[PDB]
Design a protein around this ligand. Structure first.
Ligand code: NA
Length: 276
């Protein structure tokens, strides 16, 4: 009975039909720690941050939190946010090291998603599908990396202040979004970093740019996952556009978790898809 584990950048807390545990990251100011778990009031956190004048920070999970999440299962897949932008992958590898010294029959694969959010979700769902198909651990461990090559992520961000203050995007890139009504469109790069594609004024222009990006990426109507930070309206417009243009039936629109809400910011969208 295999176990799936992911950091909270995956935005989800359950995978119906699977054994799954999310491991919280933490967002902090000088005054308060926000743990990205079931207790988090994200709307309140965003309100605090929008009027907070000082620096804010994020932290990866402790080794103890990973160990708790592994439980005592002998076959575990762990999906992490990109090693290109976070120490999360390393923390998971450190926890795996301890776990294997404590569980002699265990197999644990840590997967650097090279991404975040909905792309981590798509990976988790594919792991689930292969497990349900009866594939063995070693088959899944090989195959998931091949599957990941046929997935992409795009985002549209209305503010990149939190990314920029934490050194995760260049100032020049972030400055575009400082203008009211301008968003920055990005993709997950081959190095697992945020690659800015361009700027965009308004929802309709974003829909057209995304359609062009999806076409070029080899999108042909496969699985599509869209998370949003208090922008269900835009996420629903994107989903409608994609259904109409590509005939997609496997679509889910859902809310971002704490970590993705912090870095994508209010208004932000992130989407991931399977490609040919
Ligand atoms: Na903006």
């Amino acid at each position: 009975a295999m176990r799936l584990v992911a950091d909270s950048a995956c935005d989800i807390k359950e995978l119906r039909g699977m054994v799954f545990k999310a491991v919280p990251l933490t967002i902090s100011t000088d005054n308060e720690e926000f743990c990205d778990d079931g207790q988090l009031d994200i709307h309140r956190m965003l309100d605090i941050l929008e009027k907070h004048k000082g620096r804010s920070y994020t932290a990866c999970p402790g080794i103890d939190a990973w160990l708790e999440a592994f439980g005592d299962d002998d076959e575990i897949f762990v999906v992490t946010i990109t090693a290109g932008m976070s120490g999360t992958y390393n923390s998971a590898m450190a926890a795996r090291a301890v776990y294997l010294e404590e569980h002699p029959q265990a197999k644990v694969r840590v997967i650097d998603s090279k991404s975040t959010g909905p792309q981590m979700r798509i990976i988790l769902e594919q792991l689930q599908q292969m497990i349900e198909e009866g594939k063995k651990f070693e088959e899944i461990d090989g195959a998931i990396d091949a599957y990941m090559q046929k997935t992409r992520l795009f985002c549209s961000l209305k503010s990149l202040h939190n990314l920029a203050q934490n050194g995760r995007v260049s100032k020049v890139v972030a400055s575009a979004a400082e203008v009211l009504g301008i968003s920055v469109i990005g993709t997950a790069s081959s190095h697992g970093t945020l690659e800015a594609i361009g700027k965009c004024r308004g929802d309709k222009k974003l829909l057209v740019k995304l359609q062009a990006l999806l076409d070029d990426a080899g999108y042909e109507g496969g699985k599509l996952r869209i998370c949003h930070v208090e922008n269900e309206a835009l996420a629903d417009k994107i989903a409608d556009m994609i259904k109409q243009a590509y005939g997609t039936t496997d679509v889910c629109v859902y809310k971002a978790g704490g970590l993705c809400s912090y870095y994508a910011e209010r208004g932000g969208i992130i989407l991931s898809c399977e490609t040919k």
